[PDB]
Amino acid sequence: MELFDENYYAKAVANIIGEVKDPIMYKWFSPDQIEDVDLQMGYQKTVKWDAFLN
């Protein structure tokens, strides 16, 4: 520690906080693959319909 008034020379202050960036998980999926749902907790059931020729 300096024994003189070193705080006098602190003539500039920069504070690094960053920023809330986009999640990197978006890079692992195509835009069409992601679809939001309205839920907070529990279970949701999705039905896939299918067709075939007899």
């Binding site: 986009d22 978006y26 890079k27 835009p31 992601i34 939001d36």
Partner: peptide, 28 residues
């Protein structure tokens, strides 16, 4: 926003818009 529920809905919509913008500006 009138209330906290509307504030939360606005936050979710903002997140969705950010995701859409990221995918539109992404170039692989």
């Amino acid at each position: 926003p009138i209330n906290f529920t509307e504030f939360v809905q606005a936050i979710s919509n903002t997140y969705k818009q950010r995701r859409i913008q990221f995918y539109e500006n992404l170039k692989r």
